[PDB]
Amino acid sequence: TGYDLSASTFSPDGRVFQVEYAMKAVENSSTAIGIRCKDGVVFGVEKLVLSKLYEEGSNKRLFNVDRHVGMAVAGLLADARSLADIAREEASNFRSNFGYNIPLKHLADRVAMYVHAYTLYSAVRPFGCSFMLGSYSVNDGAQLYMIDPSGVSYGYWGCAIGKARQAAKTEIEKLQMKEMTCRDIVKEVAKIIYIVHDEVKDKAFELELSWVGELTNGRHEIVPKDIREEAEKYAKESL
Amino acid sequence: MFVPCGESAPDLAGFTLLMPAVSVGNVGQLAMDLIISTLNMSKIGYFYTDCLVPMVGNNPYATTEGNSTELSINAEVYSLPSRKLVALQLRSIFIKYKSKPFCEKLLSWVKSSGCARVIVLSSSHSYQRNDLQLRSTPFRYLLTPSMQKSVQNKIKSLNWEEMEKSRCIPEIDDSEFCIRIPGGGITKTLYDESCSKEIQMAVLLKFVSEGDNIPDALGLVEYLNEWLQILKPLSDDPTVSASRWKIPSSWRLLFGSGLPPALF
Amino acid sequence: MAATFFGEVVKAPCRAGTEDEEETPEDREVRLQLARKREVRLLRRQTKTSLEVSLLEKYPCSKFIIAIGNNAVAFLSSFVMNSGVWEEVGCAKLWNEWCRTTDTTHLSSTEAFCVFYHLKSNPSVFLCQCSCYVAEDQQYQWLEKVFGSCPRKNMQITILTCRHVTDYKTSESTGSLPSPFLRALKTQNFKDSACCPLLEQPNIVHDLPAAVLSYCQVWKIPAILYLCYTDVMKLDLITVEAFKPILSTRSLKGLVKNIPQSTEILKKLMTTNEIQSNIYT
Amino acid sequence: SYDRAITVFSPDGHLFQVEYAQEAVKKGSTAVGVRGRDIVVLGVEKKSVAKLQDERTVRKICALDDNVCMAFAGLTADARIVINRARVECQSHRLTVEDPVTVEYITRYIASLKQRYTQSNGRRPFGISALIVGFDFDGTPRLYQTDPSGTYHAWKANAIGRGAKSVREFLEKNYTDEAIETDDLTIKLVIKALLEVVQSGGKNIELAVMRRDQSLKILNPEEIEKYVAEIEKEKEENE
Amino acid sequence: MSRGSSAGFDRHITIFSPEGRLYQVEYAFKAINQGGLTSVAVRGKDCAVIVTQKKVPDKLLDSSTVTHLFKITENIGCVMTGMTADSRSQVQRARYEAANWKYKYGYEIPVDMLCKRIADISQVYTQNAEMRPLGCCMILIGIDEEQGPQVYKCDPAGYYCGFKATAAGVKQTESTSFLEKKVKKKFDWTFEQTVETAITCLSTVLSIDFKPSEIEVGVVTVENPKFRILTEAEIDAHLVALAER
Amino acid sequence: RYDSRTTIFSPEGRLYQVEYAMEAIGHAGTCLGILANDGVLLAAERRNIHKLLDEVFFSEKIYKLNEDMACSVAGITSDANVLTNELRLIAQRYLLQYQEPIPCEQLVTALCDIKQAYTQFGGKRPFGVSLLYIGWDKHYGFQLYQSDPSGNYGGWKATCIGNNSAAAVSMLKQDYKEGEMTLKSALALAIKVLNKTMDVSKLSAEKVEIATLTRENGKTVIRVLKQKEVEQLIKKHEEEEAKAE
Amino acid sequence: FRNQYDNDVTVWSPQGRIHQIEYAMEAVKQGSATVGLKSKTHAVLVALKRAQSELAAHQKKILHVDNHIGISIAGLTADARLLCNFMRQECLDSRFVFDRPLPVSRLVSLIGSKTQIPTQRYGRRPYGVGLLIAGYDDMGPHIFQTCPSANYFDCRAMSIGARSQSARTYLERHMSEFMECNLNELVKHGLRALRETLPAEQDLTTKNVSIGIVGKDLEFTIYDDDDVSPFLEGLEER
Amino acid sequence: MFLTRSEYDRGVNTFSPEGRLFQVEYAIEAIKLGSTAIGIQTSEGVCLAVEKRITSPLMEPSSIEKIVEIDAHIGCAMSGLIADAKTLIDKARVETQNHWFTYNETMTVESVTQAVSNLALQFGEEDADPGAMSRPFGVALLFGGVDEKGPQLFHMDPSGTFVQCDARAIGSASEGAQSSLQEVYHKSMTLKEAIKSSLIILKQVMEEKLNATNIELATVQPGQNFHMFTKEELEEVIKDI
Description:
The structure is cut from a larger assembly and holds eight protein chains of eight kinds. Chain D is of the alpha+beta class. Helices cover 34% and strands 21% of the residues of chain D. In chain D, a hairpin with a 5-residue loop joins strand 8 (205-211) and strand 9. Chain E is an alpha+beta fold. Chain E has helices at residues 23-32, 84-105, 111-125, 172-185, 196-206, 235-243, and strands at residues 39-43, 47-53, 69-71, 77-82, 136-143, 149-153, 161-162, 165-168, 215-221, 228-230. In chain E, helix 4 runs antiparallel to helix 5 (196-206). Chain A: Keywords: Acetylation, Cytoplasm, Host-virus interaction, Nucleus, Phosphoprotein, Proteasome.
């Protein structure tokens, strides 16, 4: 500890402490899950309802970021918004010039490069948030990439971030996601969300879900209400 | 004005006295709190003065409900004749234009009382380290001439590192090597006054990083431990001291109250 | 203390509050003149003399109920001063970062420098009224001006003050507490029963009421502090009624008489309250 | 306060740079001026005798324009920069608003520059105060005196620098209409005023007057030694 | 103007020590070993080969997306050691760098020149006040025109050199010792008694026999100069050849 | 109350940083100039004790500026290099703008303005150098100007800077004359000065700079005196104190 | 003691936390109370006015922005004026380029984007102002709450300022009975909610309430003093 | 909790604990060093009076222009740091003229004060040279004017906030003046009635005694433009005490 007052500093043993602080910042927020299936990608984030007053749909974390990729965040909300609408010009700066649709690997490698750019300057602080990147296409299948404040990019078969990160992943790996279709996936996603969800300290949450893939033909979109409701019914009866 | 809690006789004719040095991190205060927590020194009296900024707590060393309701101020005195120990706890900070007369009054009272040893817990600014102390361990020690000439065998055995006191008229090549503790608070004044009074007194300081000082406090209490043995030889492979040094109950949340559920 | 230009040395201050650099003859000459400047004069108003002997030795006391904080002084004044007849033997002559601008004034009606009051029927009851922020050395100066070093065993003290709920530290978020709320601290010798729950162990009090409480407890004097954590320090009705449980304690049973006339006095006072800025702060 | 944001408000508001530069002019060499009926005298001492000097270069008295002179006290080089900038501005006005500038206008320009060395963390405050004096467009006498704060007051007659106060409360104790009726007595008041502060006699006090509508005339070490001429006026008629 | 450097010798890079030793550079050097990975680079007369672990402490991960061999040009590749993000960035930097080189001089950048330019970029970081050194070391391989293969490694300090054989990471001292021992005596290294020796190095210094899932190997050959990476379809066969002796 | 970054006042209004700058001046080589009725001569001290030094060409502290002036320096030598380059630049630019040589006062003013400006907005260290100026113009004849890092300056018939400078001028002002100070007598008495203020080491021809400013035939001529006349003068000196007893 | 870490916006604490942002959070609730309820058809704004500067006309909280959007302030006046000036500028740009009102859900996103800018960089401070914005468009009535956290909240009835939590409790209790209300009853409910923040010894006067309304056909009109008498009158006590 | 390190106002624009910026409330009562100024806004017009607190007799009083007019129908009263107060004034004047020629009418008082408030608040761009102070203004302002309101009064504090205040007093004795004024104020006040009450309270508040030179006042009424009172007017007003 100690030498943790600027991003542009190194520990006595060689660490950037104000990236670990962001690592524990994403810990503060609530869990988010995204699973890559046989022929698509399914996201899911449970949202804490701070008060019944708030209209449903506020504080959304399931950002449509183009026609064919989807994005879910965790951590500091404002900076999550910032990276979100950053990822909607990197797309334009790839389609306005290169015409076709952004591959996930390149989009990640630039947005990860951007967040790493922030993680290395004293005049700025790292974005205290981590987020996911999912999509699908016939020419590229389905992909999922996770980005943390450190600037690291990794593709995941299944992943999660948030204060139930460990429990989320430990519930995730028990599934054969590589060969299951989205219908069997959504119920599992809600199951994981409710299983890892903590109420005794974080009662009054809400379930939110979205996907992209074959069922919607490479078009990112929120889960239709009926599927959401039947999956919620499954999660409740899965008790 | 050292007032006991009940107008009694603390008879501190030969008990080692402990006091911390108000310095960066309050690592001395933290280490002393840990010491009182682990050895459970009882509160015997108060060291009343018009010197420090006044704070009030309710027995931060609380263990049970009964002792929790005991009012606490910045200045209390804990002692333990079981192992011949007496301790002076300081919670708040030093008012301007008052630290040095306070030190003088403290040593005058010590002479009136006559404790055995006047060991001091201190810390120094880690950014004001030369390369010689930057290459080595952050453990440093100073002992008054009256008591060093007798105990020096133990320190010679335990492989400490003597602080190299630097020129206090530095630019002159023949000026005297002289006491200099950066970020020492009242430490240098205490040391100079103690050697002037020829009082057996010890100064142990460490170079401290910043933020949480729990590693710093545990290192400092261990550094006191190997010389004092006021607690069993730790036998560095702990198996106990990993969970033997019980943290005072007051050391609850420190950095804030909680996450305000309005932004995450 | 950096960023005068680009690429510079920050020099963060110190964590024991040690940024005082750890005394030339002209330095303690000006120290003499400065110490004689910042004089806490126990001024016998319109006479300003005959008060060298401190109150505990000047006039034996039985009850010293003191209010610190604009709302504390408003509370005590409105709920006691209207009840009985309280003349002022004197006040405290105090200059510091607060209550500046030629402290000798119209008595600073919308300010306060520790105006004391005592009763007619039983003049043994003292009420000190001030939110003035005395200097860190000046708490001791004032206390030995009024009390001295002779702590008598016949007088009892009630202290009121307010601190922001932001300062209060509990496992839950501050913005989730039922503010305002009450806390208290008792001396070692204060065997009297309390009316509000004691302060939690980590959170402390570091100020003038802490000075008074330390003096009373250290010197065996029984005294009690009463503390409300509110959200606004302005002259607030709600935080006034927050202290209402004090209207049941032993030291107060014989003083408060009429609630609604007090409430109308309060509405008068805060309708004519300070011209506190429209910044929303 | 310490280094950064060099102009920081004090805990009560005592902007430290302001009075810190204020103290700079109490070690500044004492200057003074008098606004007479038809003459203006501008006296100043040089009690840094260094008699192996060229007095020409170490004048205190600089002239701003055809109609303005001044004296100062404090950091000399800063004052020289002030003088050059003010000369430039005076020339620009005489070009654009072509007229001999009034003393007040150039004084206000000076004050505006002086106070605009308070922003912009950057720039530090100037350590001079000036005695701008000259005859107007109409031929009335004028006088203006400023301070590093930025204020640009006007006086009947004022003194600045080392021991300026004692000169001031000598001045009102002697400034009267039956002291300015004659130009010789007009300058004689200044003579006596610095006699109160000079290094014991007419030693290295440099002064010059500006009678109406002619020029700045350097009161010089004449055969009579203009200086000691008036000096002996006081020597042998002050009894 | 800016927040500025924290006052201290080790607090910031710009300040020299009393002996003018740059602390933050050492902090970067012993920041490289984060991630535990240790890489080895050796070269023969025909090929230059770089080998490192593939730590996959999670099978939610995809082995494809995790890697440390990043092709820079079709002819020139590199390996990464240190934190991931700065390695990301310097890979980007060098790709851009070599592309600009070819565009502006009309021929493929030499390995040594690319290493020099990257070293310059790393060095300029140690000059400024809110730069933080990119705590990662990057190693090159390639065939220039006549010198056959070359191996180059810059560092956060900006120091680089050409190596007949080198390594970087945690067990770097032991790797260098074994490298010296091997290079002093046996030095032909055609293609199989070649860098496979460095695989033996990495196994011996690190752990028990490896099976290829943990190993990531890329090569360039004098007779076939593409930067290209072998798989467990390939690396496995190599290492069964090595296991038998 | 606290000192830093060349733009903050102490509670007396005088700049600490510039006053520190006038301390290396107290450590720099002693340098003095003398104004004669019909010339200017300038002395300085070499810190060049090392016999391995060479290439004493044309000066070692006497920097020549325009067609007719030269300066002398004491302080941080590279700072001096920058200052002298800048001085030459504006001198030549004034000539360009006017087709007249710069008057000495104008040049000294234009330089000390920049020196003062570095005691202003910014924060970078001021020039740690005090400068002497010797030159001539049609307005005023021979002139001699001293420069100060604060931007202060003055004309002197005789002045000294460097170590012992206060003592040197203390003897000078009890020694200098009003206007019978001929070039050779001024040289001799300057050499007596430098002898007395010079440190314990015996005075040598190999430690003095003597350069002079003279006029003949409508031209201003500046020479750096060769050695031979230097032993001539110094042995002359030692024999006219062979009078002094 | 983590006060090395609560000193610049650009410094993380060892809690995955930013303390300057939460200090800005605490700053706004030192402002004035407000109410932001809604109906199927109306969005109104109830505000309490700084009746502490007596015999001096008071401030203004409900500021007209565009004919279909109005806002309220409870934090730093400086940030308030800057943000409302930006509001007007952006609304004018929208009506210029597109010749249609700017839908709220995008304007508020732009608000968030702008206020995030100082959150990340040295030498700046978060916009320490609390905003209730009210507006109506083709989608329908909206109420958006804004906090210096650079994060906005879409609620249907909000209160920010002193003692706002009591109003929040009241609004959460009466949530259901706002969906169907004519203009006057909706305004009455908001008024009652605000009044509950006031001590029972206080009453909403025409001198300290600043009702403002937008509607499907009523453009955003701000109702100042006595003009609010019809809404204020007929109000039963607590 | 234990008191430790803390950077307090290193950065300008650092929010205090309980969210209350430093320089702003540092300047608020750096103002209190300022001279007392009084402004009354009645239907008949407004009056602006202020002490000049002549330090020494060696100044002629005419120099201290404590009161200026932003325009013929906008008079201004200021107290505190005069230095940048004049820059505030100059911006007000140029803005008034800008409105005047761009929009052929008289710029209303409320918009003048609003634009002046706009001028403040631009503290921290230390890297950006153009448009800087890095320092809040340390001067409080009072505006009087006549328009299709007629008489108006606006008080500005060094925080970019203002009010349609009337009978609003600022200065060292500001609180005492405001308190006395509250009980003195009358809703319907004749013009010299405001003059009289304001002058009495000035005499009552300031340290030095009161004469013609000690203070000055100015008025604007719907009748005609700014008027600055001359000496003999001050004697013929203070004749009646």
